Amino acid sequence: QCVNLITRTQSYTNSFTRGVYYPDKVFRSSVLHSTQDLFLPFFSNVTWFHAIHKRFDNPALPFNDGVYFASTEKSNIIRGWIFGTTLDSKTQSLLIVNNATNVVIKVCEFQFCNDPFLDVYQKNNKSWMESEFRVYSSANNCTFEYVSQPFLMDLEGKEGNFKNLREFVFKNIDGYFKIYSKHTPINLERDLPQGFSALEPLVDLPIGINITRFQTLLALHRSYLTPVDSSSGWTAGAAAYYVGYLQPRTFLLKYNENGTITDAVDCALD
């Protein structure tokens, strides 16, 4: 199956000092060192998407030289990732599923829909077990498989205030996909927090592929029943998330006695 939203219809904000990760796998204590690589430029225009959720989009996010993703979200409605160029079963592409049970890492040749998303899932007993599935529905010419721990923290956070923030960095160098993660506790409920933290390498996949475009996956119940109001409720404003591009410069850093990242300065800033 495939449901496409025919009626289709970007609030720039600032990131202060985010996107700092350990540039290698060595430990230095209380010294200063500088490397040249791809970071986030300090105080750059970052695109905060549609801050509603009723509302579902099919945007076009171009991929170019690493992407910093950041979107705090209660109950973990955000569940997947798309990476590829053509998305019409021509070449290889990468897909990430981050559901509660496990993590699924695919490199496949799928027939992706123009808006890949699961709708409606009918009735078992007051519970979430999926019944409908429309993201590719075909083109299963892949024999790749990968199981690890699901990166996202668990679900059903119904606090009134924002509690958890999830930030990731995806880097594509030499076909050696590097993922940097940080789950952090924040209680300020206002956009990107003003603070300093480090990112850690935990996922390294050597595959080799060309990526020019990217998207992500959601999962929910829009109607919970097939006959009544199956799919007409949504328009092009899906969710709110922060995407930043990466630039290569020098980002001289200071360590503590514990080796944790404490401060970093951008050389060509001021």
Partner 1 sequence: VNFNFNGLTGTGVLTESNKKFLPFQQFGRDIADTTDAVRDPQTLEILDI
Smaller CB distance to partner 1: residue 25 or 190? 25
- Name which of 223, 254, 256, 244 is nearest 39 in CA terms: 244
In this structure, are residues 267 and 35 in contact, taking their beta carbons and an 8 Å threshold? no
Q: Of the listed pieces 22-30, 85-93, 156-164, 169-177, which binds partner 1 according to CB under 8 A? A: 22-30
Q: C-alpha angle 170/119/78, rounded to 5°? A: 25
Smaller CB distance to partner 1: residue 131 or 184? 184
149 binds partner 1 (CB under 8 A): no
Minimum distance from CB of 22 to partner 1 (Å)?
Answer: 8
Q: Of the listed pieces 85-93, 148-156, 233-241, 258-266, which binds partner 1 according to CB under 8 A? A: 258-266
Among 259, 263, 267, 269, binds partner 1 (CB under 8 A): 259
29 binds partner 1 (CB under 8 A): yes
Smaller CB distance to partner 1: residue 198 or 220? 198
200 binds partner 1 (CB under 8 A): yes
25 binds partner 1 (CB under 8 A): yes
Minimum distance from CB of 214 to partner 1 (Å)?
Answer: 26
Minimum distance from CB of 261 to partner 1 (Å)?
Answer: 11
Beta bridge partners of 190: none
Number of amino acids touching partner 1 (CB under 8 A): 13
Smaller CB distance to partner 1: residue 157 or 259? 259
As a whole number of angstroms, the distance between CA 252 and CA 265 comes to: 6
As a whole number of angstroms, the distance between CA 7 and CA 234 comes to: 9
As a whole number of angstroms, the distance between CA 23 and CA 118 comes to: 38
202 binds partner 1 (CB under 8 A): yes
In this structure, are residues 82 and 68 in contact, taking their beta carbons and an 8 Å threshold? no
State the DSSP code for 262. E
Q: Say how many Å lie between the first and final Cα of the chain, rounded.
A: 54
252 binds partner 1 (CB under 8 A): no
Q: φ and ψ at 172, to 5 degrees?
A: -115, 90
Minimum distance from CB of 241 to partner 1 (Å)?
Answer: 27
28 binds partner 1 (CB under 8 A): yes
| DSSP reduced 3-state for 190 | coil
Which three-class secondary structure string do you get for 80-142? EEEEECCCCCCCCEEEEECCCCCCEEEEECCCCCCCCCECCCCCCCCCCCCCCCCCCCCCCCC
258 binds partner 1 (CB under 8 A): yes
Smaller CB distance to partner 1: residue 59 or 201? 201
As a whole number of angstroms, the distance between CA 36 and CA 248 comes to: 7
Smaller CB distance to partner 1: residue 22 or 162? 22
Minimum distance from CB of 153 to partner 1 (Å)?
Answer: 18
Token pair for 169: 């960095």
206 binds partner 1 (CB under 8 A): no
* Positions in the binding site for partner 1 (CB under 8 A): 22, 25-29, 31, 200-202, 258-260
